[model samples]
Each structure stands twice: as C-alpha cells, then as structure tokens.
Target: MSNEEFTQLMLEALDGFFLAIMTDGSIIYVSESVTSLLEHLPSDLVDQSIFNFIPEGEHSEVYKILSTHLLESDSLTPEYLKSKNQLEFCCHMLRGTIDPKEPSTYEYVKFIGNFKSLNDRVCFVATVRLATP
Candidate 1:
C-alpha cells in the first residue's frame, strides 16, 4: 500500500488525541489532535523521536514498555511521565491493532493517549470519538 493509505488507516484506528504511530519505538504517524493537546502539531512531530518529549532518565523504561506493547498487542493504562520543565500530567495509554473488514487492506498498530494535567484541581473531561473506516 502507499504511505498515505497506510497513514490514513492508522489515523482512523485511533480513538483519541490525534493519535500517533511509532515503529521500532520512533514516531511515524501523528494525528491532527496533537496540535490542540500539545504545543506542536502532528506534522511537526513526524519522524521525531518519542523520547524527545520524555525525561532522559526514564527514556529506556518508556521505550521498553512501548516496545513490549507493540510486540505483544498489550494495552497501557494511565501513568505519569516526567517532563523537562516539571510539567506533570497523567496519561492513559491504549495500544492495539486495527482490522477493518474489506476486500483487502493494510493492518496498522494504534496507540491512543488521553491526558489530564495534575495542576488542574478542577475535574475536566476531554473526549474524542473515533469514526469507523
């Protein structure tokens, strides 16, 4: 399949937060929601290392977890990731494969992260819906 077709398939598999796909633990697909959630847009995140946003010391652990999930098709729950400037937030991670029934298609791995700032005492809920391809 063409790269664009592969990317579109991965994007549709995402459930929330402008999902991004990583290969060998590096970012490949970045969703549009990344612009609204993070300071950077999805396009800007393309080909960038996922470890860049995470703290240095925790890089290996994060990479291991992500790598394992990708290989095993396991899901990750809410966990706190260290930031460069003391930014704290809890992120819920969900990872899995996408298989839409059709004559023929490309299968993609999907990861979705839902985030909430710890600094905000107010209970706020952010939701994004994934449409069927």
Candidate 2:
C-alpha cells in the first residue's frame, strides 16, 4: 500500500495514540487511542498544534529532534516521550510521501508516529503525519 493508505490503516488498526499533523503545525488527524489515553476526542485536538499536548520543555526537545531528523533523512529513530500525566511512552517516526505521477504543488511531509507505553512495555502503533502545503 502507499504511504498515505498504510498510514490510515495503521491508525485504525493500532488504536493507541495516532496523530497526524501538517508541516504548518496544525493537527489534521487523530485516532481512537487518543480518546482512551487523553480522555479527549480527535475533534477536540484537530486544528490545534501538537505542541499543545506536549509540555514546554519536552516540546523544545521534540522540535529539535524533528528538525534534525527531517533535515538528514525521511525517518527518525525511536525516542522517549513523557506524557503530561508523567506517563512515559516511546515514539517511532514514519515519514510520508507524495504521488510520483501527480503534479502536486504542495511540498508535503507527513509523519506517522507510533507510540507505546514505557511502563507496560506493550507496544502499539500510532501514526502522525506532517504535510506542507
């Protein structure tokens, strides 16, 4: 399957904190897992920056990592993510692509992020996308 198609499928299948954002920093998609984890619905999070969910200190680090990774490659190595409630989680970055045949004007960069609880060691897949229009 294509990157976008696989991303959507993974979001539904994983149900464990899927989030998709545009390169402009606007949240575009969220999965059911978000509700379970945050007690909030995807609709509530959309249009808001993902940074809102992350703490200030952690957000700074996250931004740095994102910048560095996107600069060097299409993917990012796994990193530790501490939740607002002090829960620790892990994140794996999956990048997005554009249709080769389509003459699209937007320079989109998507991120499919999989998040898992560090405490239980139960790994779940979450997809985050960052697109630039």
Candidate 3:
C-alpha cells in the first residue's frame, strides 16, 4: 500500500490525528484533523520544519528527545515500540493557544507514536491529543 493509504489506515484505527515527520524535523504529512487541533492547514505544514511549530524555549528539549529516541536508534519496529514507548512526547502548538491575549502562549499536546525507518530515512508516526493539565 502507498504511504498515504497506510497513514489513512492507521488514522482510522487510532483516536487522534496522525503525523509523519522525517528525522531532519521536516513534516511529510499530517492528517486533516490537524487543522482543527492546531489551527493550521495541513498543506501549510507540509515541508515545514517541525521546529516551526515548537516554541523556541522547548527546541532543545524536543531536539534532545528526537535525537536520542528516534534519530540515534538503529531500528524502529512496531515490536520495539511495544516494548519501548520512547516516542511519546509533549509538544507546544504554534497557533493553538487557549488565551488570545498571549500569542506566545501555548497549549500542551501529548503525542504517542512510533518511528519507521524507510530507505535511508526515518519516518515518525504519532497520534496527537490535547494534554490535560
């Protein structure tokens, strides 16, 4: 099946939106529901660096996590994710803040997903949900 088809299948089984990002932090695809959750069109996000959505202060944290958990790993199989849920992380939205008064304000989002290594590249697939305070 095509990547899009596979992503659709996964999204159908999962409860939240799906994201497929590269190891270099570039976004490949994001489910349509992302528009509702992040207030940005999926088309706009494609090819954009994942860092663009992350708050500046949290860049180091996110870089650390992605580098340590996804980039450095030799393998990223579903079985591995079952045993090690290291792909889980909390992210800040670029435009989905709850308070309009604070544009810099951000709401936390919890992501749970795994990585799949393609030909010479790593693809991260995650389910995103609003984080509870």
Candidate 4:
C-alpha cells in the first residue's frame, strides 16, 4: 500500500528485528518485533545507550564503526565497505539473554540498510538477525 506499510511488512517478516541508533550510541527506535524475538520492550530501550547491552571488549570497535562518516556517494556500501563511504559492519552484539531478563548472549549483528543522515547527526535503521549460539 504505502512505503511505510511495506517497510512494516519486511520488518514483520523477519524473525529478528530492526533498531535505529544515533552515532553517539543512543537508541532512538526499535521495531515491534523486538519484544517477540528478545522478549524485551522497545519502550525500555529507547533513550538508552546501545553500549550498555554490548560487551565491554567490543565497545571500542563498535563505536569506531558507528562513528565513521558516510559520504553522499551512490556506490559506497558492502561488507566492511571499502569505498567512498565505509559503512556496514557485521559483528557480535550482546543482548540475547537466556531468560531475556538475566542471561548473557551474543548475536552476529550487522548494521546495514538505510543510513538516514540528517543535519549534522547520523542515524540508522538497520536490520538484525538472531545469531546462533
């Protein structure tokens, strides 16, 4: 029907979910499917630092990857991109708790999809999938 409707369809179709985050590590949005997949509420995660859920050892790399700038070039994207704008990184992200309340877990999270750059700020609407244990 509409663009957003189609976006919703894709998000819903996936067993995993999508999440939007600022370059500074703040989480702005998460798809509704997060609750179903992670048993965690998107409401609680909003305004929270994404680093809080991530492992301490992996923070630096993740931050650096997120901090990198994306130029306005049509052909700048790939796995660990090597072009005008280097974006998209597939790495492990912590958030998969066994109890969804108190256990530890890691998922092969890839920050890919739309990079909605507005103003001097950067944000992402990236798709995520569940990583096998």
Pick the TM-score winner. 3
State the displacement of the C-alpha of residue 41, model 4, in Å, after optimal TM-score superposition. Answer: 0.5
lDDT of 4 by residue, 29-57 (tens): 88777776665688867899888877788
* lDDT measured at residue 130 in model 4 versus the true structure, 0 to 100: 63
Off by more than 4 A, model 3: 1-15, 71-86, 96-105
Q: What is candidate 3's CA lDDT for residue 111? A: 75
Cα lDDT of model 1 by residue, 1-133, tens digit: 9976765565445434443433333455555654433435666656766555544565566556544433332222223322112111222222222343533322222233422223422111222333233
Compare candidates 2 and 3 on lDDT and give the better one. Answer: 3
Q: Please list the residue runs of candidate 2 whose C-alpha ends up more than 4 Å from where it truly belongs after superposition.
A: 1-15, 73-133
Residue 54, model 2, lDDT? 56
Each prediction's whole-model lDDT (CA): 0.40, 0.46, 0.72, 0.66
Candidate 3: residue 47 lDDT (0-100): 94
TM-score list, all predictions: 0.40, 0.46, 0.71, 0.66
Q: List pairs with backbone clashes in candidate 4.
A: none
How much does each candidate deviate from the true structure in C-alpha RMSD?
16.3, 14.9, 5.5, 5.8
Model 3 has an lDDT value of: 0.72
TM-score ranking, high to low: 3, 4, 2, 1
lDDT (10s digit) by residue, model 3, range 38-127: 677888889999888888898898878876775445455534432145478887877655567875655588777766755555678778
Error of 4 at 64 (Å): 1.7
**Candidate number with greatest lDDT:** 3
What ranges in model 4 sit over 4 Å off?
Answer: 1-5, 69-86, 96-102
